Amino acid sequence: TIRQNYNETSEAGVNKQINLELYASYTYLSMAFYFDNTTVALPGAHKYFKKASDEEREHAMLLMKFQNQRGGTIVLQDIKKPENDSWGSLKDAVQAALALEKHVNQSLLDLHKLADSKGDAQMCDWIETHFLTEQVEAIKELGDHITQLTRVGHGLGEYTYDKENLG
Amino acid sequence: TIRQNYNETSEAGVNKQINLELYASYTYLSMAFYFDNTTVALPGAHKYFKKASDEEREHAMLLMKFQNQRGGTIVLQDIKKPENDSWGSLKDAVQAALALEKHVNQSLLDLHKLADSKGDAQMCDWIETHFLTEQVEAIKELGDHITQLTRVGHGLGEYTYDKENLG
Amino acid sequence: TIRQNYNETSEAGVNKQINLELYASYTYLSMAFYFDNTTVALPGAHKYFKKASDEEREHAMLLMKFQNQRGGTIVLQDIKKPENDSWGSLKDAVQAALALEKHVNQSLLDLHKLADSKGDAQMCDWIETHFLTEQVEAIKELGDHITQLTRVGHGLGEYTYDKENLG
Amino acid sequence: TIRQNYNETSEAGVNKQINLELYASYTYLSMAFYFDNTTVALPGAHKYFKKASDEEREHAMLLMKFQNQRGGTIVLQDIKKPENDSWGSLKDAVQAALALEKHVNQSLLDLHKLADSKGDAQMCDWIETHFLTEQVEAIKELGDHITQLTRVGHGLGEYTYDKENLG
Amino acid sequence: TIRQNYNETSEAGVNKQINLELYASYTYLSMAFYFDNTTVALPGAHKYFKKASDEEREHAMLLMKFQNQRGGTIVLQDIKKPENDSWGSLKDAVQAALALEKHVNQSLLDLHKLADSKGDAQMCDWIETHFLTEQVEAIKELGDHITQLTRVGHGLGEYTYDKENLG
Amino acid sequence: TIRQNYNETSEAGVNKQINLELYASYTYLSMAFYFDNTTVALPGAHKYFKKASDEEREHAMLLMKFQNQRGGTIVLQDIKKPENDSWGSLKDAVQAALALEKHVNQSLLDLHKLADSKGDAQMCDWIETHFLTEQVEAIKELGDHITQLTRVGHGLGEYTYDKENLG
Amino acid sequence: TIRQNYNETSEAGVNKQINLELYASYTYLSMAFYFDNTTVALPGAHKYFKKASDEEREHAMLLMKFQNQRGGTIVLQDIKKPENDSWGSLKDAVQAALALEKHVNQSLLDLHKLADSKGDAQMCDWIETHFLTEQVEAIKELGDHITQLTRVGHGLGEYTYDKENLG
């Protein structure tokens, strides 16, 4: 009785975006506690990736909120474990996060294209409002970090950027 | 001299959306004073529908504001009286309002589709920004009310939800 | 079971004074946004007639609350559109509103005479408290406005009085 | 070089209590948004189970911080989806959570017994400080909730207890 | 490594929008100091066009910010001098600014159409969010000024609107 | 359905602990009001033992809250009148309290050894957290008062230590 | 007469622990003022190790207070001069500190075991509360310091970590 102009493949897409967000929350959680391991001991990346872990959880809840708003049905799936147990250098992890956000960005743009093909005017604006530009700004930020992590180099530079920039 | 990329059927659509909003303001006004009748005596729905009556008036003024912004001409028509003189149970009225907002939602989505076909980029975003998601959230809210009004049932439950939720 | 000394004919007059108030509100809303149109562009008039639209909408709602309080039943009719689509000069519009308020005063006086004949002291005093003096002042204000608008003439004076007096 | 009196089997129990906590968090997130669905529409339950989702997610992270502090290595597994897609009545859901917390208490007690057998006083006291009493209270709270939900019955009472007690 | 779904003709369009904004900043700067010439001595238009000069500079920087966000390359060109060295009456200059903003509005709508044809979902929303409605409201405002500058007429009227409205 | 890892013996032992703190509370009240008697008239000792009476009462209430929290059943017994109807000198009653608290301490340690023997890890930590260390601080306090009340002697010593240290 | 459940060997062990905690403060005091030597001139390390020395002297007084509370007897031995008059680099001193903390941790765990095997439930919990988890926190912290000291390297890095992290 509330569902209106809400295509069933869109509802499917929304249910798949939820898992991808939760999967990205779990990767940043792994990364965050990787930098908390004594042998890595980078507390600034810890802080930086715990916050990314929190925010990607919020994104998943926004989609579940969205799924209920439009009259859809939320269906959850296993949250896959992250592709690695350790994440290398600070620069390595940022690199791995850039690739994660680009992949999430394509799913969001495909989800938008799908919704657009089915005439879902509110769903498109909704994805634009809550996701399309945050993704762009998240990706620009990781790129910047990577350039800067290259410039400062390993060793003291890595300590510094971790402390004075991340967190 | 200001009109730019503003199709004349769009201007017509905007003029018809104005009347539909004013017609919905008038229905919620009828509903609001129906609950003020001693034989109904639901002061919380009174408050809830007076506020919906005010907000649907504001929507109509936003469109008139919009009509003048884009270079169009506002043409007003008779505001039809509401389809009923009394509105039944609290649950009945919410049900009648859900159906009103769904109908308004389709007109807004058709108005958007029309504007889109004529390339009106600003008009589309404008409808999305001011209407498409407020409609979605208004519809989700009425649905929720209806589920809750079913759960509490008639009698004391109806008194309670009126007092402790509506207004 | 609350109706007392409330005559059926008085109930009908209230019902029709309600529709009359909604109609003056619609007329002022029309004038308000006529002055928002770029080809007119008198911002003060726009604010002046928009708040007059809000006020005669509140008159209608008082009459509606009164109808209920005394134990009548509200019956709404269509609100006919305004007279005109455009309202000419600032002075033409104030003169048009004067005529409107003037007609509105007469049916209030008619409603008062009707109630007196039915021995309805409370309805008579209610009408004097909320309407009869507040119309006398509105009519005096408009007469003042017309004179002043006549004094300052067209062009620079119309802008001046619109900016410095209305709103 | 910081590991001390930390047994490999205890490290494995922590790793699996981590995954267990993430799993209870996912289950509660599932219940939280089941109550946000319009066909259910219990706002209090939604806030109650969303904050319980946040909490058992923090349990997982404590265990993660502990694993690192004592010199183990974190190993994450997939978080299996919840049991069910819908959770029935408010009382069904609290009973389901009771069973869940109940299972979670047992493996904490198992983890405690395991650690005791390895002579691991610090890990035992850590588990008592952060988990063992905080589970006893959670289980008592849920038992209380079930009784109360049993007392107020279906319909108006479920709404009442959802509004006035959960959240 | 950050560029994603960012068409190279879009990047070209963005680089051309930058120059058009800077060109409009420079015209309003000329206009602003024209009204500062003793022989014109309109200090309110001075203030009004210095602020428009500042804001059109900001628009150009938003696009450069945009160009770097999406992974593009900023390429600057000569900022052409304004089409006139003097700008006539206050009404003449506003008229010249209306025509400037309408031209800028078409470039923005063409830039949007281009981006839309290449599927750039984020770029479209971005142009809508930062430009499409500010343009509409800037154009409605200049039109209004022009109507009012006609009404007040030359001489004292021109002094007044300059002082009491512009700035 | 909330009971877990809570042995039937422990529960019996909690019930008699309940009775033994209530017995202590009442012994301490009798002491307190003995020192309020005009023939004794030590206002410090009255305050001191009325306070300890309240604390042992709170202990008994903590123990009843724990019985409920772990899923047992409170079973109350008669509260036996205290050992004496009068308590001699100030040092005498402090000495009776030391004996009493050592009896309560040894009961708590047996209740702990019982609970340990059944693997009730939460019970053990609860007794450590609220009882075992408070008993040892109390006993040190009592031993300290006796040494001092020995050092100050009878007469003006007793009076002084009553007024300046106890209460 | 206050000694209850306090074994002869538990007491000898607190006395040995008092001396051990006194030995740590002396070593850390020695570390502290080495980093104050002109040929060393690390002010962070001095601040940081002066604090370590204070803390370990707090720990010694806690045990001295415990021995008195349980009715044992404090017996003091000489406080041996530290192993080294000089401590090398910052990372060398921190590594020495991690070794002493693991040693001190072991005899605490040893002391905890001795008391367990005598059934001293209070003494065990007392060591958990004031010592075992503090030791794990200190050992983890020291670890992190060695990893970061390796990462920042010699020279500027050693200076940087000393200023920006230690004190």
Numbering used by the authors:
A (entry chain C), B (entry chain C), C (entry chain D), D (entry chain D), E (entry chain C), F (entry chain H), ...: 3 to 169
Quote the original article.
Ferritin is the main iron storage protein in most living organisms, playing a key role in iron homeostasis and detoxification. Canonical ferritin is composed of 24 subunits, which self-assemble into a quasi-spherical nanocage with an outer diameter of ~12 nm and an interior diameter of ~8 nm. Ferritin has prominent octahedral 4-3-2 symmetry, and each ferritin molecule contains 24 C3–C4 interfaces, 12 C2 interfaces, 8 C3 interfaces, and 6 C4 interfaces, which provide several potential pathways for metal ions and small organic molecules to diffuse into its inner cavity. Thereafter, we introduced a self-assembling strategy by designing π–π stacking interactions at the shared protein interfaces involved in two different kinds of 3D protein nanocage superlattices, which is referred to as key protein interface redesign (KPIR).
Subsequently, Pro156 was replaced with His, termed P156HAfFer. To elucidate the detailed structure of the 3D protein arrays, the high-quality cubic crystals of P156HAfFer were obtained, and subsequently, its crystal structure was solved at a resolution of 2.50 Å. As expected, the introduced histidine residues formed two pairs of π–π interactions between two neighboring P156HAfFer molecules. Additionally, two pairs of electrostatic attractions were formed by Lys93 and Asp94’ between adjacent ferritin molecules. Although such electrostatic attraction is also involved in the formation of the SC superlattices, the designed His-involved π–π interactions play a dominant role because wild-type AfFer cannot assemble into such SC superlattices. Although the adjacent P156HAfFer cages are not aligned along the C4 rotation axes perfectly, the dislocation angles and distances are almost negligible relative to the entire cage-like structure of ferritin, and thus, they do not affect the overall SC structure. Additionally, in their SC crystals, the C4 rotation axes of adjacent P156HAfFer cages are not aligned perfectly, while the P156FAfFer molecules are perfectly aligned.
